[PDB]
Structures are given as structure tokens and as C-alpha cells.
Amino acid sequence: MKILVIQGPNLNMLGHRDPRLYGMVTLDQIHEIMQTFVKQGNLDVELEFFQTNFEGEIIDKIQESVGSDYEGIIINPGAFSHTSIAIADAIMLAGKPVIEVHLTNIQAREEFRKNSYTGAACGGVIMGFGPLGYNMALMAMVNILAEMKAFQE
Amino acid sequence: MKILVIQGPNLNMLGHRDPRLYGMVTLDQIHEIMQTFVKQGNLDVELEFFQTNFEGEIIDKIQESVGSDYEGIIINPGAFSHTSIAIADAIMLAGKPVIEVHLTNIQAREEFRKNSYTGAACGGVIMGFGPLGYNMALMAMVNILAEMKAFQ
Amino acid sequence: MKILVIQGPNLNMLGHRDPRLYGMVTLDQIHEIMQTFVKQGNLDVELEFFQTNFEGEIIDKIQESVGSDYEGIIINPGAFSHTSIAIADAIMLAGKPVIEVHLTNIQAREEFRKNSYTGAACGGVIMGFGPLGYNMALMAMVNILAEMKAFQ
Amino acid sequence: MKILVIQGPNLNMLGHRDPRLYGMVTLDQIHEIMQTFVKQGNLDVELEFFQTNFEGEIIDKIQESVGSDYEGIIINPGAFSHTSIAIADAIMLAGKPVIEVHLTNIQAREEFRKNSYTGAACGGVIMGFGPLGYNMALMAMVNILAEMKAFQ
Amino acid sequence: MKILVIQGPNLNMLGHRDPRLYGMVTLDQIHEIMQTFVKQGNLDVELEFFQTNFEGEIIDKIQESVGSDYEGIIINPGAFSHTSIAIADAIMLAGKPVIEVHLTNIQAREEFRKNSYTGAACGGVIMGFGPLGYNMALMAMVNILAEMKAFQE
Amino acid sequence: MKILVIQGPNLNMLGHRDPRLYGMVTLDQIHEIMQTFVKQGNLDVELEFFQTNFEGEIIDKIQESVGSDYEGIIINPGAFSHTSIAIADAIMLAGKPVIEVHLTNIQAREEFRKNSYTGAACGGVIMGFGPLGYNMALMAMVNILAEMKAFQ
Amino acid sequence: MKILVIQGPNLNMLGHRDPRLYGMVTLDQIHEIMQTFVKQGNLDVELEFFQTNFEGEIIDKIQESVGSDYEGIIINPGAFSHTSIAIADAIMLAGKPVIEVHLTNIQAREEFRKNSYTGAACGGVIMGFGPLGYNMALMAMVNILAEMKAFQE
Amino acid sequence: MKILVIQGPNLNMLGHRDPRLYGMVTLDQIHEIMQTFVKQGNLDVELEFFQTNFEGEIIDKIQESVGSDYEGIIINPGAFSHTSIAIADAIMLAGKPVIEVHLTNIQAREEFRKNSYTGAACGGVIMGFGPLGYNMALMAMVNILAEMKAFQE
Amino acid sequence: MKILVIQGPNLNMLGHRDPRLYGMVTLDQIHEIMQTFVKQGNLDVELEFFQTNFEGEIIDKIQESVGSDYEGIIINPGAFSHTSIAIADAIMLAGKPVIEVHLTNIQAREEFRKNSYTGAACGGVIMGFGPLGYNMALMAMVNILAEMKAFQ
Amino acid sequence: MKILVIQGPNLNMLGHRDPRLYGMVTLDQIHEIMQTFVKQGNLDVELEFFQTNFEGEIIDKIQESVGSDYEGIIINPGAFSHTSIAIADAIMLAGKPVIEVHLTNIQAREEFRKNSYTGAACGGVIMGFGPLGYNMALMAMVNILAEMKAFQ
Amino acid sequence: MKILVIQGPNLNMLGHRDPRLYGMVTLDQIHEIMQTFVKQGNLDVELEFFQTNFEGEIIDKIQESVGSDYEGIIINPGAFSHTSIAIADAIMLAGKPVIEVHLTNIQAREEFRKNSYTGAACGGVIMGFGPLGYNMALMAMVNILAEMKAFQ
Amino acid sequence: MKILVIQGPNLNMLGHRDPRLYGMVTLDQIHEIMQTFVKQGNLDVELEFFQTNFEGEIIDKIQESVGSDYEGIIINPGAFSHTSIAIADAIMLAGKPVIEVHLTNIQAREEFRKNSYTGAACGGVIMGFGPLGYNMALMAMVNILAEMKAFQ
Ligand SMILES: C/C=C/c1cc2c(s1)[C@@H](O)[C@H](O)C[C@]2(O)C(=O)O
Ligand SMILES: C/C=C/c1cc2c(s1)[C@@H](O)[C@H](O)C[C@]2(O)C(=O)O
Ligand SMILES: C/C=C/c1cc2c(s1)[C@@H](O)[C@H](O)C[C@]2(O)C(=O)O
Ligand SMILES: C/C=C/c1cc2c(s1)[C@@H](O)[C@H](O)C[C@]2(O)C(=O)O
Ligand SMILES: C/C=C/c1cc2c(s1)[C@@H](O)[C@H](O)C[C@]2(O)C(=O)O
Ligand SMILES: C/C=C/c1cc2c(s1)[C@@H](O)[C@H](O)C[C@]2(O)C(=O)O
Ligand SMILES: C/C=C/c1cc2c(s1)[C@@H](O)[C@H](O)C[C@]2(O)C(=O)O
Ligand SMILES: C/C=C/c1cc2c(s1)[C@@H](O)[C@H](O)C[C@]2(O)C(=O)O
Ligand SMILES: C/C=C/c1cc2c(s1)[C@@H](O)[C@H](O)C[C@]2(O)C(=O)O
Ligand SMILES: C/C=C/c1cc2c(s1)[C@@H](O)[C@H](O)C[C@]2(O)C(=O)O
Ligand SMILES: C/C=C/c1cc2c(s1)[C@@H](O)[C@H](O)C[C@]2(O)C(=O)O
Ligand SMILES: C/C=C/c1cc2c(s1)[C@@H](O)[C@H](O)C[C@]2(O)C(=O)O
16 A cells, blocks of 8 residues: 655754754654564555645645555644645545644644644644654554455455 | 636645535636636636646736736635735735635635635635636626726 | 515615715615616516615515515625624525625725624625625526526 | 513524424414413413514513513523623613523534623523423523512 | 714613612703703704614614704714624714713723724714713814814805 | 432532522522422422532543433533533533533623533523522423433 | 813824824913813813823822812823823822823724723723813813712712 | 553543444453553553543542653543643653543544643643554553663663 | 641642752641741641642532631642632632642743632732742731731 | 832822722831831841832832842832833842732732733742731741852 | 934843843943944944933933934833833834834744834834844934935 | 845835835845945855745755855745744754844734744844845844854
């Protein structure tokens, strides 16, 4: 099964900036950890990784999850989580399972980070586990897609 | 007269997703309905259609309108209606007629859809008629322009 | 089909006061324009016009609509748009098409004009086109009704 | 005991519109149910019923309750509950017991129904029991009037 | 000159209810005091008195101040002061001077009395002087209409 | 009919403290008044009374109403009305009729008493009648239970 | 009887700045108009005029209305109307009648002018009549002090 | 390692009430699934399960995580998530890792569920995965405690 | 005189956790300091100490105070200060002196600590002095009681 | 040690006005009570008293404290507590102990008295004890200073 | 050019207190830095410096700028920026260019510093550059005064 | 010094639309004025200019400032100032000085312009001076870079 990992604005700077707040592990390193999670689990999962600082590129990518190629999305929308009704609508419209991940606990930071339009549109949200949250999302997504398959059969 | 029809984020997914909310007519089907409204009315209107999920492509397109080709805009900014001061400002600086259309009644949904920066910047707003709203906007734009050329 | 045109408080003062805000066409002149739109289109539409400054007369009239004479309402509730839950409720219980019209763009004036209880209760809202907005509403109501009789 | 039952706007449409929210029992049926309750408990109570969509008619009627004819009021102000400081003041100035009734639970619907200016002016408030709430009010009104008289 | 005195909902109950809050002087007594103010001043003023509990009657009356019969309005809108955008618009549209009077200080009571849509539409507001406020409004209106006349000449 | 009457925090201090606000009738007296009301109307109703200052004991007790012993609850949550989402959820999950009672009019006191999470979860709410409100609730509960059974 | 007229911050610039908003009549001219109002009425009133841009000077002056010399105060607190809980408390503590005057209608301007801590502390408020409001306050104060005298006797 | 699973008010009614909103799987069934997760993983984890409808019992239990017996807590505070500053403080004071779990997405329900005092106090939050969220929390906690151990050595 | 010292949720963890926020003196050490303040002053004061994490145990204890044993309460409600209308109400109905103490300055922390329902219900509040605040409260309670017995 | 006692606007009117709100003891009487508390305790405390209605005189005085004469401030800013960021800032920059006192419980009055910029800037706040609050502050300041000289 | 530099409350404590927030450069040093900037660019500018903790002295001084002596004002109102509608009005009534300066970024501190009534009244606002901001203001003031004169 | 000047959405329309609000000077003219300012003060500064209507292009460009090419950024984010937490975070993560400029005074326009997420992330903010503000920023940037180097 194909799982699309979408990483939003500023995430490409992971490990390179503000280690104290977001950690030393880079985005390329998180994605290799996700692939090793699959390999070791022998999961029937093909991951695709996509990062962008553009709202419109995120939406275009989500819409491309139309065709029977991608089954689920794992998304960290970054700061667009708090502001983008347009990505939230794209998630609602996608009609495939979407899981939201935040490295930090967005309940425990500035008041302006508390709202997540996107996260409200997603089936589930994971926050404050750093990079591990992404392996937690994989685990979850595999289970959700298998349970959807059982129900269809 | 040249009329530019701008369709904002997610609008291209019409008729393919969430039919009970946004209906079964696709974006291509709305646009051919608008064309038929023109043809069948022998209106002297040349339509151009543009869809995008990018706020900046919308601004670029509104600014591209400045050069005596395009005379009015009919815009559905989608979710950017509620969030984009930047598009509101582009509308303000465009210095020609802009009508906002919404498929749904944005007073009757989530609280976060009630604010419209863009609609506040347009001369007129139409909402809740589905696709017919775009034909309503055409009727308006043609009367507005007609009346503008007489007053000049 | 019978269409009822309800004009709320102050609307009768049109063209006699504050022309730079609400224009120079009077309420009688808008209504004869709507009639001409019907006649000149050979629409099978019988218009009835009603103006009042009384919230209760508006409710009475919406309820009087219940009996298979009137098929849709075109309403400009005036200032009651922003304050009258009671008219919103009458609209909800009326069980037929209601379109709200506003002469001005109520997203672009005082903050207290942004809320519309009534417009939230209507299928569609039109604002900011001046008098033309009522012709836009007629076009809509006729298409809505047409489409309703086919689906029955 | 002469007890005035005032029914506010839209209440005359009971049973005739939106049965799923407000029930199939009509206003006339509720008033027969109140008389049946007065009989089958031998309350020395004479009911007077008054329905209106006019705020001012409700205020006129409350003021009429000045003369030693009517001893208490049972009121369902409808949507005026949420908006009418004028009816709340009329209640306050009346100096007779008033009891507010709502068919629905106005803590469990839209946010705009939670405020009741009127309810706050009343001695007590009943909500969410449908037509029975009016009998519950009768029960309390007879009791309140008894207490006042024992004190006299 | 003709001055219209509009008294809003509940005002007809003055002196008869809640003396403690609104006083012992009745509405009919305030209006006789206003007429005696004119008579004694030898003011060229004809007063018309109108009370109603209907928003629509107030608006109808204000609109009737169209014809060159009434020059100014003195209004106590009562509780409609706080709620009626429709009366505020009627005042704005009237294009004759309108003065708002409150018996009580509506800054010193419930929070819901603080907003006055109507008072914001009026040229001036007088509050908290009881019945005297109405003679204060007369004095003011006479002066305003005389000053308007001088300016036109 | 087994009907559980739950009385929330501070309610056991009735009559013993602040008589001017909450009356001189004690909680024990209110419960005798409820039994007297069941007798003098031959309601086939058995009352169980429970008072506590613990939120969790109220939730434990509502959950106990799972087994086909207790058919309905009459609750005065006290100050937990304004604060306890946990009791409101217990009410929602109970799937038996619940009716909320307050001695005072909680629309007419401090701003912090106006919210009732619990009341919103209940089928109906009664306030401002003092001890009588509990009898009013009984009346409604017996009726609600009858309607449910006729439907069964 | 002695009536103290307190004029708050910026009022000394009347007639000299922003004529369009506050008028051409200067503060010294308003005070002469008030004195002519007394003279012509033959009112038993001695006026004292005091302007200051200092909150503390206003409060000190109000407290000086302790001794049986001043019977009433007519105050335009200016912008301190909206901000000074300290002047509002001084008014409450004074226990003599105080009337608030605004040249403009503070209901019809910026949202930040709508609150009047001071005006809520005063028995009455007059706003939007320009200079005339001060003669309206005099009229009112004379009537209030005479009515207080009758009641004491 | 000992992991304490705290389940808050109403959770004991899982599977028995409102299946549509919270599911058919009971609380006792979730806890057996967590134990099978451990057994199958061969994790060095001893689970203790505790449910209560009492705020004070939750706090007492958290404080009992003082002694070097329990290393981490997995908590679903239920409705106390939104209201209990006292449990949030107990979490802050505990100085052991605490993970918050919600069955539902509390961003996508009533406005009153959006605030989580407790979740802000926790290192991480998981929401909207139903029962699976608890196995996701276990996975996370095992990883967090192992990483803490490596760092101490 | 008997003085009851009530310490609310988490207070028992003092000096064992978060020393930089709440200090290094334990709850037992504060209480023996209060005892020494009494002894060393030969005050005629008998202290009783009570800590709990349960809102209902606090209410129970305030109500238990009603019987002419206990003359005043010194309370630190902890986090319940900000949330418990139920304890505020218990304080109001207790009908004797209650002083609230907080170790920290609750005006100078998170916004959610600024509201104190309980402190609004107490005669006096002390905050920000650490443990010394409890000795300050003792000094106050003894002067308050002294002055109360003279006035009786 | 030198302790400066600053009394803000209106405080000089104590005991001469509104006795039921602020009591009958004058400002001079409070200050001689504080002196007696010192003398009778043989505290090594030299008090200086300052009252003013001027925000700037308060700031001037706090800044004048900078020079090794004055060691701590006891302040009642009066109404400036709720409005003066400028005094809050002066307190922050003063770099020595400041205790705020209020005669009344400012959590239990108008909503506009609940905010205290100044009290948020002080180490400790005392409110609701009347004049005794100033003796409480003295006790605190002496213990705070004592403890500060030992730690140096 | 005579340019008045007004420094508001607490500003005279620069360098003497809280160096970590406001720097180690004193107010006197900032004013020498401004003179050095006028020299090393030959601005025909004469500076006058005025610091005060009194709102009324700031208003008195702004009013003094009436007479054709002072052509512009450079002001750092301190905390009065956030609270003084009176100083904002004095700025508005002055009819000479005024420029506001803050040492710190008042968008990046407490929520209560974000509002500036004064800044809103000024032609421009500078923040977050420390002492340099005053030179930046000088630069703009000389330019603004030039533009006005070219126009003259 | 390589200094990047980023100009946000709508800024390329300077001088071409709404001259009354934003002036007649074009973006190209502002950038020549900045070069002229660098010359006539011999700042060893090389400017790079970048304008875009795309939020993501602004973030891409700020990230490009990672490599030791560009030492500081001067940014006018346009309307993204009020809405873009994403650009504010890019500013924060950049770890080079950034200075925000606005042509207009964003404290003196609509309420929706007062918030600046970006400005809050920046070292300083300049507003209301028109084109000159960019030179003021240059002045500060060269200084800030000097201070950092002296420290190096
Ligand atoms: C290199 C930057 C990573 C960021 C992650 C996030 C950012 S910025 C923020 O813009 C957002 O508020 C929270 C966030 O999505 C997270 O914690 O994962
Ligand atoms: C295929 C999606 C169409 C949408 C239309 C709209 C969306 S999403 C929403 O994002 C917006 O709130 C309302 C809206 O502009 C409309 O009703 O036309
Ligand atoms: C002659 C007055 C006409 C009015 C129209 C309207 C008014 S007043 C207002 O009271 C309302 O806010 C807007 C409005 O409904 C519209 O623009 O059509
Ligand atoms: C036929 C309509 C009945 C209505 C009743 C009510 C309405 S409308 C509403 O306008 C109001 O909010 C609640 C209400 O008073 C009730 O539940 O009884
Ligand atoms: C007999 C009732 C007189 C009233 C006057 C007024 C009422 S009710 C109120 O409804 C309104 O809030 C204030 C008011 O207009 C006034 O003080 O004059
Ligand atoms: C002896 C105390 C009785 C109380 C009742 C109530 C209290 S306290 C309050 O805590 C609550 O706000 C209202 C209330 O439920 C009622 O009016 O019945
Ligand atoms: C020369 C300035 C006169 C002013 C008067 C007033 C000002 S400023 C304002 O500071 C205030 O908002 C209203 C005001 O008190 C009034 O209209 O009288
Ligand atoms: C049987 C009830 C389970 C509940 C779970 C929850 C409840 S009630 C709620 O009280 C809370 O808002 C969310 C919640 O913690 C969750 O989704 O896990
Ligand atoms: C060991 C924990 C002590 C606490 C004290 C307090 C807590 S937690 C808090 O929960 C409360 O907000 C403030 C408080 O009451 C105080 O400062 O005394
Ligand atoms: C003689 C006036 C005394 C005052 C004291 C106070 C006042 S006015 C008030 O202006 C302030 O809100 C509370 C206060 O500081 C206190 O209770 O000590
Ligand atoms: C020695 C104190 C200097 C201060 C400056 C300022 C203060 S206090 C504050 O009171 C204000 O909020 C911001 C301010 O104007 C600035 O950053 O320049
Ligand atoms: C040609 C448009 C220029 C604009 C500038 C600005 C705009 S639009 C606005 O979108 C923004 O609120 C303020 C602003 O950044 C400024 O004053 O420089």
C-alpha cells in the first residue's frame, strides 16, 4: 500500500535550525527511520515523501491522492495547521484516511498554535513525540488500512 | 468585453467529491453553462477561466488584469475568502468590478466561514445558489459594465 | 407561479433620503423594474409587493404564505436582518424558497451589520448590487421553482 | 384566579410546520390540554389565551394585566426571549408573577438561544418538556398565588 | 416650530410602576411640564406627544417627520435604544435634528443598557436627570433650530 | 417507577444557611414534599434520595442507574451544573430520562451561573420555583415515562 | 451657590486646534457664555473654572469640594473619562452632585471612547451639543441644588 | 518497567453506552489488548490499570507514582481534561513521563472539548484513533523510557 | 478559639517537587511553623490541619465547621481556587471567617490562575509570600475573631 | 531598615467618605497604628509615609527609593492598580521588595477592579482585611528583609 | 529645525535598572548620540530634551509646541503608549509631525503592550532597535520637515 | 554586507494603483533610493531585491539566506504580516537579523492589520514613513551587523 508523507513549511530546516526546540534529527533522517520501520516490520507499505513551503503544493498533492495509487496520508502541515482552512477542506474532500503529526505539543506553546483547522479535519492527531510521532502515525495508518480492508471484504 | 472567472482552492474537485455539500456539477460543467448563457444571450462577453490552489497565482492573475484586456472579475476564492487579506488587497487595488460567488451560504455553516475579507473588498457578493450563482454574477457583471460605459 | 416581495424597515424611504448610500431609485421604481423583467421575459410569475416597518407584519406575511397561493419569497429585511431571530425562525418554518437581498454589501459596513440571522435561514443571499439585486433574485427564484416542479 | 397565557411569535404555526423540532400538537391543542388540567384538578383558575407575532402587542397585553383582573402571566416569548429587553422590562414593571415556558431546551440548541432577557425577569423558567411545560407552569402559578394570599 | 416628542416602550407606565427606579412623575405629567416650559419661555414651539410600545410605530412616526411640518424630534426609545438598528437607521435617514433622552444613567446600570444604537445616530444624548432631561432637550432643540435658521439666512 | 433524586453539593445545607437566597425548607423537608405529591396523586412511583458534595459519587450513582432498577433521574447538580462536563457526559451516556432542577433562577444571578453543561445534556430544565420545582419534575418524569411506554 | 466647572486634558486647546471636530468657540469663550447665562437668569450661582491636563489635579480639586464652599461640579474629564477609575472613585466619594459634559457624542466615535468610568459615577451625562451642553448642565445643576434644598427644608 | 494506565470519568462505560460515538470495545477489552501488545512484543513492561470518576483519586494515584515503582503514566482524563487544572498540576509535579490519550478527536467536537489543561502538561497527546491510541501510547512510552535509560548511562 | 487549616490539591507534594516554583519547606514544616507562631505568641488558638485532593472532602469539611467547635478557616484551595464554584458556595454558606492563602502570586502566572471563585467568597486573600503567608493569615484570623467577640 | 509606605489616589479621603465601603479609620490613624506595631515590637524599622493622587509622584517616589536609604515598599496604588502599567514598570525596575495592599477584596467588586498590573509586579499582595492589611504587610516586609540580609 | 525629544515614564532609569531588557546606555547617553548624529550629518537641527513620569507634563509640553518654535516631536511615551488616550489626543491636536519610538519590540512582549493609542496618532512608529531608533526618527523627521517645506 | 530586501504581495503594484494610500513612488524607484542611500554614505553593502505574491517563495528565499552569502533581511511582508505564522517561523529559524518595514502605520488602519506575526519575530519594526522606512532599516541593519562583528 502507498502512504504519502507530506511535510509542510519550514520542516526542511529540521536539525539545521533551532535544535533546542525541534531537535537534531533532520527531515531526511526521519524519513529513513520511517523506511527502516517498514523494512523491519515487513509492512506492505510504499512511502512517498514530499516537503513544501507552499500551501498550494500541499493541496495539489492531496488532490493527487485521488487515483487508486495512494491509500493514506501522514501530514505535518507546520504553521498552516493553524491558518489553512483551504488544506483542511482538501483533507475533508480527499475521503482517504489522513493523520496529523506535530513534533511539538501545540497545546503547550503560544496561544496562536492551539487551533488546528487541519487536525480537526483529520481522523487522528499525534503531537509532542518528536520524530517518533511519525513512526506512531505509520503504525496507526497500517492498522487503519488493514481494518478498512477487512471491512470491505 | 473580457470577463475573467477565477476559481480558488479545491473548486477543481467539484462534482468528484462531497456531492451532498457542493453538488454533482463539475467545474468544467459550470464553465460551459456560463458560456451557453453568453452565447444564447448574444452577450458581447469573452470569458476566461482560471482555477488554482495557490493564493499567489490568484494575486498574480488579478494584477495581470490591469492591462486593458480584462474589464471585470468574477471570483470564488474558496477558503481563501475567510483568511486572505492579501487577495482582498489585490481586489482593492485592481480598480475594476469584482463579484464574489460562493456555492454555499457561508452565513449558514461553521463560524470560521462567516468572515470574508475578499467579499468585503468586492462590490457585490452572491452565495447559496450553487452553480446558478455564477450565471447570476455574469448577468450582474454585464449590467455593471454596460452601465459603466454609458456613464463614461 | 406567485412570488412575494417583502421590503423591511426604512426601505420605503429609498430615493428620498441618503442617496449616496442607497441610491436614487425609489422602492416603487425597483418594483416596476421587477415587473418589466417578468413581462419582457414572458415569465409565468405573478409578483406581490409588501413593505413594512413592523417585524410582526413581516412574520404575519411569511405565515400567510403557507396556503398554496405563494411559491417563493424574495426578502430584504432591512435592519431586522441583523437582529430578528423571530423572522429567521419564520423563514425556517415557511417551508418554501426564500432569497435575501441587500442593496449594500453588509460585509463592508459597520461591524453590527455583518450578522444576518435571516440570511443564514435563507437558501441564498445577494448583496451589494443595488436595485439590480432584486432582478438577480427573480432570475434565481424562477430557476429554483422551475427546477423544483421538474423534480416533483 | 385569572391567568393570562401569552404565546409569542411563530407559536401559532405549531404542528403545522417543523413537527420534528416543535411537535405535532397545535397551539389550540395545548390550550385545551391546559383547560383539561385545570378541570381534572379543580383549580379555581380561568385561562385567557393570547398569541401574537408583535413585540408591542405582547407589551400592550402585559400592561393590560395592571387592573385587578389578571393575577399572573404564563409566557412563551418565542425568539423575543433572546432579543427583547423591552418585554423583559414590561415583565419587571408588571408586579405580578410571570413564568416563562419554552417547548425546547434552549440550553441545547444554537448559541444565540441561550440568552433569555425575559427569563431573567421572570420568577421561574421551564424548558424542554414540550406542551406539558405549560401545565407545569400552571401548577407553579396556582401555588405562587396561594403563597402570596396566605401572606396577605 | 413643531417638535415631536416620541416616548418608547414601557414609558406609559411611568409613575405607576417601579417609582423607586423611574420616579413618581407620570408621562402625562412630564408632557404638561414641557408645555409649561414653552408657555413660560414664550417659545415658538408646538409640541406633539406620541408614546408607543411598537418599534414599527416609532419608525412610521419618524418617517412622517418628512413633510415640512415637524422640525425636530426628542426621543426616549426605551429598551429599543439598545437593540433597534432599525430606529437608528430611521433617525439617520430623517435628516432633521434628533435628541435622545434617558431618565436614568444608562452607563450606570446593566451591561446590556450601555449600547445605544439610536443614541449614536442622534446629534446629542441626555441621561440620568429624570423628567428634567426632557426640558433640557427642549432648551437644546430650540437653540439648535434657531442656530440652523440663522445659518440658512 | 423507580425515580432517583440526586442532590448536588451544598444542598444538604438547605434551610440551615442563607435562608434569604435558598429558603428555610430543608433538603429532608423537600423529599417529604415529593412523597406527599406522589401519594396525593397516586403515582406508581418509588423515590430514592441521594445527596453528595462529590462529583464522582454523582457520576457513580448515575452509572448505577444502568440496571433496570431506576427508570429516570431528577437532578439538582448545584454548582457542578456550571463546571462539570464529566457529569454532563454521564447524563448523556445514561440513556434514561434526566430532568434538571434549580431552586433559583440561574438566568438571574451571577454571569458564571448561566452556563449549565448538565442542563444542556438533560431533557428539560426547571428553575426559580424553589422546592416546588422538584414536584414539577416528578409530574414531567411520570409523563415522559408514560409516553415512552405507550411507544413500547 | 458655588458651582465648580472642571475641564480636563486638551480642553484648553479648544477653538485653537481641530475646529472641524470640536468647534471654533474657545474654552475661555464657553466660560463667559456660562457666566452670561447666570447673569441673565439672575441665578444665585458663583462659578469657578479650572482646567488641567493632570489626573491628580482633577482629583485634588474634587476633594477640595469637601468644605461647605462648593455645592456642585460640572465636569468634562476629556480622555480621562474613558480611562480614569481614579477620577470615577473621587466622584463617587465626593457625595455632591456631579454632571458630566462632552462636546461630542462619545457613542458615535471610536470604540475606545464609548466607556466612561466617570460618567457612570455621575448623576447625569450630557453629550454632543458642543458648548451648549455646559449651559444645559448649569440649568440642570441649579434645578438639582434647589430641589435638594426644598427636600432638606 | 511499570506503566500506570489511568482511565478517567465515564470510561468504565465504554462499549456499553453510545457505541456510535466511543465504540463497541469495552475498557476491560482495551486493557487486554494492551497486555497482548506487551506479551507479543516481549516488552519489559508491567501494566497497572486504574479507572475512576473521581478527580481526587486520579491525583492521589499520580502522586503514588512518586516511589521508584512506576516509570510512566498513560492517561485518558476524560472530561477532566478540559476542566482540571488540579490534575494538570499533579502531572507537572510528577516529573515522570505522562502521555495523554483520547479516543475521539477533541479538536473536531464541541468547542468546550478543545482546551486540554492536562494535555498541555503532558509530553505528548494522541487523539482520534479509538482503542489503538492506547497501543500507540505504549509504543511511545517504551521508546521514551529506553531513551531516558540510555541517556542516564 | 479553634482554627481549621485546609490545604487543597497537590499541597502535600510541597518541598518534594518543583522547589524553584513552590519552595523547599514541606506541608508538615509549614504546619509546625504555624504551631510555633501560636505557642510562642501564647495565642488562645487551637489549630486543626486538613489536606486533600478531593473537592468534595473540602466541602464536607467546611460544612462540618458549622457546629460550635470551629471559629474560622484558613484555606489554600490550590487549583480549585480557579475552577470550584462549589467550594466558593460552601465558603459563602459557612457563615464564619475564611481567609484564602496562596504560596505564589496568582496575578503573576498563567492567565488561567487569575480567576479565584473561592477568594472572591473569602473576606481576605493573601498571595505570594510563600509559607509566611499562612502566619500572616493566623495573625489576621486572631485579630478578626478577637474583634468579633468584642463586638458581640 | 527604612520602609516607605505609599498611599495612592483617594486614600487621603479615608474615614471621611463612604465608611460602609472603606471603614471609619482615617489614613493618619492607619499610619499611627503601623508606628505602634513597630514600637511595641521593637522592630528596627523606620517608616516613611507618602500619599498622592498623582501617578507621576508615585513613580518619582519609587525611583527616589533607588539610593541606599529605603529597603522596601508597601504600596496601595488605589485605582491605579488596575490601570497603571507605568507604576507596574516602576515597581519592576525598583529592584527591591514591594508588597501591595488593598483595603477591600478586589476579586469581589466590579469586574474592572480584578486586573492589577501593579500587584502582578509585586512579590506579594494582601487584600480585604481593611487597615490590618498594612500591619500584615509590615510583618511580611520585616521577615522578608531579615531573611534577605542573612542570605547576603 | 527645533525638534523636541520627549521621554516618558521610567525612561530616566535607563542603564541604571534592568540592563538585560532595556540596555546599559543611559538616557543622557542616548541624547549625546542624537547630537553626534546631527553633527556628523550637518542637519540644521537644534534638539531639546524632556523627560517626565507625568502624563500631564507630557501633554503640557506637546501643547507648548504650538508656537512656531518647535517643528516636530520625537516621543517615547513609555507605558503611557498603551493607556493614554489623553496623550494620543494631544498628539492629534498638535498639528506638527510626531514620531514614536520604543527601545523594545512591543509586538514581542506582553499582550498589554501591543496596543499603542499614541502610536496610532503618530505619523510613524519605530520599535526594537534600542537607542538607534531615536536617530532613525531624526532621519525621518528631517525628511518629513523637508517635504513639508518643498510643498510650502 | 549582502542584504536581502524582500517585498511581499501587492507591493509590485506600488505607484500604479491607489496612490492616495501607498504613494506614487514605484517599487523599482524605492530600490534605486536604497542604492543611492548606500552610495551617499559609503556603506559596504550589496543589495539584492526580491518581490513575490507567494508566501512559499518568501519562505524559500528566507531559507536560502542560510549559506554565508546574505547577512541580513529587510522585509515588508505585505498582508502576510497579519496572517503568516509560517513566514514568522521562517524568520525565527533563520538566525540572521531581520527588520520589518511597512509603508503605512498599521496601528492606524483596520483592526485586522494591527496583528503582525512577522513583526513579532523580527528584531525591529518600522512603519508609517513610506519609502524612507527602507533606508531607515538599512541604517539599522548596517549598525546591527557592526555590533555583531565587534562582538565576534
Ligand atoms: C524545522 C521546523 C519544524 C516545525 C514544526 C512545526 C512548526 S515548525 C510550527 O510552524 C507548528 O506550529 C508546529 C510544528 O508543526 C511541529 O511541532 O511539528
Ligand atoms: C469542490 C470544493 C468547493 C468549495 C467551495 C467553497 C469551499 S470548497 C470553501 O472552502 C468555502 O468556505 C466556500 C466555497 O467558496 C463555496 O461555497 O463556494
Ligand atoms: C431606504 C433605506 C434602505 C435600507 C436598506 C438596508 C438598510 S436601510 C439597513 O438597515 C440594512 O443594514 C442594509 C439594507 O437591508 C440594504 O442594504 O438593503
Ligand atoms: C412553531 C414555533 C415554535 C417556537 C417555539 C420557540 C421558538 S419557535 C424559538 O424562536 C425559541 O428560540 C424557542 C421557543 O420559545 C420554544 O422552544 O418554545
Ligand atoms: C416606565 C418605564 C420607563 C423606562 C425608561 C427607560 C427604560 S424603561 C429602559 O427600557 C431603558 O433601558 C432606559 C430608559 O429609556 C430611561 O432611563 O429613560
Ligand atoms: C444550600 C445550597 C443550595 C444551592 C443550590 C444551588 C446552588 S447552592 C448553586 O451552587 C447553583 O448555582 C444553583 C443551585 O443549583 C440552585 O439554585 O438550586
Ligand atoms: C480641545 C479638545 C477637546 C476635547 C474634548 C473631548 C476630548 S478632547 C476627548 O479626549 C473625549 O473623548 C471627548 C471630549 O471630552 C468631548 O467631546 O468633550
Ligand atoms: C465511555 C466514555 C468515554 C469517554 C471518552 C472521552 C470522553 S467520555 C470525554 O468526556 C472527553 O471529552 C474525550 C474522551 O476523553 C475521549 O475521546 O477519550
Ligand atoms: C505542592 C503544590 C502546591 C501548589 C500550590 C498552589 C498550586 S499547586 C496551584 O494549583 C494554584 O494555582 C496556586 C497555589 O494555590 C499556591 O500558590 O498556593
Ligand atoms: C478613601 C478611598 C480608598 C480607596 C481604596 C481603594 C480604592 S479607593 C480603589 O480605587 C481600589 O480599586 C481599591 C483600593 O485600592 C483598596 O481597597 O484599598
Ligand atoms: C528604563 C525604562 C524604559 C522603558 C521603555 C519602555 C517601557 S519602560 C515600557 O513601559 C513600554 O512598554 C516600552 C518602552 O516604551 C520601550 O521599549 O521603549
Ligand atoms: C501596492 C501595495 C502595497 C501594500 C503595502 C502594504 C499592504 S499593501 C498591506 O497588505 C499591509 O497591511 C501593509 C503594507 O505592508 C504596508 O503598509 O507597507
